Amino acid sequence: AQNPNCNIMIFHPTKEEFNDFDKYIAYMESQGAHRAGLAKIIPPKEWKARETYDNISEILIATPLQQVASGRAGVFTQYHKKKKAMTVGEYRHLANSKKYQTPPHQNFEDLERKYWKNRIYNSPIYGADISGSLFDENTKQWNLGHLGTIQDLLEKECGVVIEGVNTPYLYFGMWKTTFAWHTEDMDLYSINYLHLGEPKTWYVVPPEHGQRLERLARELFPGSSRGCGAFLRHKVALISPTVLKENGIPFNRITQEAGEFMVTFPYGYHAGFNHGFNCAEAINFATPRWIDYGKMASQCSCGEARVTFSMDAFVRILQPERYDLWKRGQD
């Protein structure tokens, strides 16, 4: 069995290996990369996502989100308070202001200590989930707006044609912006490219151990757990590495820098934080190996998780027994 300790693997494809996306994902899995839940892919030196980032300031962040925390430093939830619209140039200036800017630090480990000690005492503003792409149309390799669609994969594997579309999303971050513990919708893969700016630190639980994280979360968030049998679908709960180690939960961590891709694998729980002003692009995708995870994915039916149009068909075809209850949650 490849990668039996479920370590995060880092890949350096050549330009020839960067041509065929599906084939390279399958290669990484042949080496055991999925067992970690997360992998890093460093593009060949010949590749670029676009020519420059000098002309992005006029992108609009229609609904910036202020991430307000409640709890204790290592075990907290966050809610998202909507703010007035602002441009990417306005948000960059905000991120660099004395109130929001990254503090002085020694190295990534010192900044990680500072994050976990102090996050809850601040409310950083995140531009999340903005439909769009920063890949040039002429970039032919690993262009996250030109991937094979999940609807086409389901149709290729199972024969059923379904409605829905699959497009990328932009994230504009600042120091302390936070992504809560989650797996993807329908336990899909994700791919995330850090276009510019400061790093993103990730934490991940191996898929084979995901239920250990769920059981800890039910213990740590007992009201939320009574409210919903899949409350981590709400994407609001944070647990620190120190707390995870105290409770024996297997996990790993890694820092993504500008110019690097990360892939999350089906049922790989992940969480993390941004170091300073940055911009990332991410999309969900599927492979043949996903189908069995989609059929078994938990679902939120309490009403909180509310998701895209295109998840309807995935539930309807892969989980027909759960469909009626889940759809009530959506309405």
| Chain residues that interact with Ni ion, rule: CB under 5 A | 190
Whether 6 has a binding-site annotation, put simply, is no
State the CB neighbour count (10 A cutoff) for residue 113: 13
Among 76, 91, 171, 314, binds ligand OGA (CB under 6 A): 171
Q: Which does 58 bind (CB under 5 to 8 A by kind): Ni ion, Mg ion, ligand OGA, none?
A: Mg ion
- What is the contact mask toward ligand OGA in residues 48 to 87, using x (rule: CB under 6 A)? ----------------------------------------
In angstroms, the CA 24 to CA 226 distance is: 42
By CB under 5 A, residue 331 contacts Mg ion:
no
Residue 228 among known ligand-binding residues: yes
Closest of 255, 103, 267, 272 to residue 185, by C-alpha? 267
Between 216 and 282, name the residue whose CB sits nearer to ligand OGA.
282
Q: Residue 139 region, left (φ>0) first, then alpha (ψ -120 to 50), else beta?
A: beta
Residue 16 is a binding residue for Mg ion (CB under 5 A) = no
x-marked contacts with ligand OGA along 241-280 as a string, rule CB under 6 A: -----------------------x-----x---------x
Q: In 3D, which of 60, 179, 197 has the Cα closest to residue 124?
A: 179
Encode 286-297: b = buried (16+ Cβ within 10 Å), e = exposed. bbeebeebbeeb
User: Is 300 labelled as part of a ligand binding site?
Assistant: yes
Task: Using the minimum distance from each CB to ligand OGA, give the nearer residue, 13 or 37.
Answer: 37
- Residue 171 interacts with which of ligand OGA, Zn ion, Ni ion, none, CB < 5 to 8 Å by class: ligand OGA
> Rule CB under 6 A: is residue 190 a binding residue for ligand OGA?
yes
Should residue 228 be labelled a site residue for Zn ion when binding is judged by CB under 5 A? yes
Q: Closer to Ni ion by CB, 86 or 133: give it.
A: 133
Question: 155: which residues sit within 8 A by CB, 6+ positions away?
Answer: 161, 162
Tell me the β-bridge partners of 201.
Answer: 255, 273
Strand-strand pairing, 75-82 and 261-264:
unpaired
Per residue in 114-149, is it b (16+ CB within 10 Å) or e — as a string?
bbbeebbeeebbbbbebeebbbeeebebbbbbebeb
Q: How far is CA 64 from CA 44, 123, 166, in A?
A: 34, 12, 23
Instruction: Assess 232 for contact with Zn ion (CB under 5 A).
Output: no
Q: Is 184 labeled as ligand-binding?
A: yes
Residues that bind ligand OGA (CB under 6 A): 171, 179, 190, 192, 200, 264, 270, 280, 282
Annotated binding site for Zn(2+): 228, 234, 300, 302
